Amino acid sequence: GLVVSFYTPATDGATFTAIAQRCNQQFGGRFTIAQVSLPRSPNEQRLQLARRLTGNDRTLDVMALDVVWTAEFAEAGWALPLSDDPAGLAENDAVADTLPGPLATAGWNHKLYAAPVTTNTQLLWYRPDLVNSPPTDWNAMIAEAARLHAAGEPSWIAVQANQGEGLVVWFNTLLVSAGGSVLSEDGRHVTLTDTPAHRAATVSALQILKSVATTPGADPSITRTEEGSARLAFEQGKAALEVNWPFVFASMLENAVKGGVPFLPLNRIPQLAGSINDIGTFTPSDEQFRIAYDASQQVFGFAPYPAVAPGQPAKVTIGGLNLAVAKTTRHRAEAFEAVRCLRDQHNQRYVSLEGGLPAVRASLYSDPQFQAKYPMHAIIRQQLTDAAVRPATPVYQALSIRLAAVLSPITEIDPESTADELAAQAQKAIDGMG
Ligand SMILES: NNNC[C@@H]1O[C@H](O[C@H]2O[C@H](CO)[C@@H](O)[C@H](O)[C@H]2O)[C@H](O)[C@@H](O)[C@@H]1O
Numbered sequence: 001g002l003v004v005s006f007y008t009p010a011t012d013g014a015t016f017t018a019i020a021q022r023c024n025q026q027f028g029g030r031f032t033i034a035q036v037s038l039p040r041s042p043n044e045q046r047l048q049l050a051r052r053l054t055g056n057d058r059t060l061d062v063m064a065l066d067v068v069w070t071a072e073f074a075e076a077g078w079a080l081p082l083s084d085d086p087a088g089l090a091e092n093d094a095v096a097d098t099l100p101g102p103l104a105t106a107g108w109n110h111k112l113y114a115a116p117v118t119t120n121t122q123l124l125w126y127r128p129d130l131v132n133s134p135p136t137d138w139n140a141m142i143a144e145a146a147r148l149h150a151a152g153e154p155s156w157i158a159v160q161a162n163q164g165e166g167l168v169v170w171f172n173t174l175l176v177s178a179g180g181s182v183l184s185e186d187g188r189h190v191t192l193t194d195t196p197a198h199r200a201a202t203v204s205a206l207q208i209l210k211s212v213a214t215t216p217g218a219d220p221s222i223t224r225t226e227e228g229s230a231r232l233a234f235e236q237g238k239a240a241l242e243v244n245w246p247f248v249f250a251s252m253l254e255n256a257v258k259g260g261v262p263f264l265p266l267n268r269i270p271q272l273a274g275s276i277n278d279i280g281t282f283t284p285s286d287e288q289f290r291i292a293y294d295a296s297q298q299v300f301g302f303a304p305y306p307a308v309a310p311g312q313p314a315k316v317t318i319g320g321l322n323l324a325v326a327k328t329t330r331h332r333a334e335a336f337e338a339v340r341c342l343r344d345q346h347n348q349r350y351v352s353l354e355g356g357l358p359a360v361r362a363s364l365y366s367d368p369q370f371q372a373k374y375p376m377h378a379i380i381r382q383q384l385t386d387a388a389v390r391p392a393t394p395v396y397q398a399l400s401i402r403l404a405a406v407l408s409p410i411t412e413i414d415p416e417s418t419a420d421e422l423a424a425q426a427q428k429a430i431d432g433m434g
Pocket of ligand 1: 009012169
């Protein structure tokens, strides 16, 4: 029958293809979900979607939107409110058995404009064979990296943060962790330097950025403007400390079985031969997962995101993907039905245990079966409960562009003057300037 297009980031394409295919089996020919890949960066994802929307591409049906785009797509009329579902089932489905943090990312003006499908929060990953105890705050991160450098051991702090949204996320986590905020609640005012407490928080976050940037054993690519990957930098053995989203777990094991991780030769374990399936995905038995995880645990561990202040946890910036229905769709009913299928319990378990992307269904974090294959579950749920949030505003694209331009390169940050420049650029963003 008809075709419901389903646009997702390229990196997650394969995963959302599998899910889509399963859902197609459940429809029996009534309609077919067809996954289509967007570019890698959130900015480019947004740009492709917005060009199709303003161009009235009537073949665009369902969008996997980054959490930071809701506001814009809601206020422009691009993402239909879930109340526009002709069946009237979308809102109740979206809230049922769904964690409140992601739900909050999917709303605008007290209405839901998308149904959360995946969420995200950054954890600390470390080499336990080189780091005796995972650092609990950023001062300890710095000290541990310096110690590793003084010993000829891999000394990088692999943070997914170049000159784009990753750097803004890093800064936002440090800022909210110190009690600060980019914008006011209503999104109408810049709150980086408007009070002494707010300015102090901003200055603390910037000092952490500058100190990490100028720690001996730093990756020489902090000024060399490229697009390196913290995941790969850790997998190649150049970093003993990484902060990144949980999918790196699924990466480690998988690439370790493929022979791509030098310090973790899971490819040399006979019991794991053939655990990579015919399309390149690590799909172990229960026994094979036990073997792989046990071997991994000697050189690969995880821990909470490092706090900025000793004594209490960090407040970690939430990310993820919400399923929105395009205003361009010719088939609202089928599009919302597809959304409901793509986020069901089976497909949530799949998106986590095979795609590595944290699920939004609360039940799964209370599911021992799920917990056995997703060992980061407790820290993830805890950080999702106390999550930091990037400001929700229709001008988020320009705001993030300007903030990243000020923050980069982090080696040239001067906390006081940089705080003032961040405030000025954020004010330009919310004033209407991009
Ligand atoms: N760190 N900020 N950069 C983008 C964000 O990271 C996340 O999205 C990106 O990383 C995940 C990996 O789990 C991919 O699935 C996404 O496709 C990729 O864009 C996060 O979920 C986003 O909200 C952030 O903006």
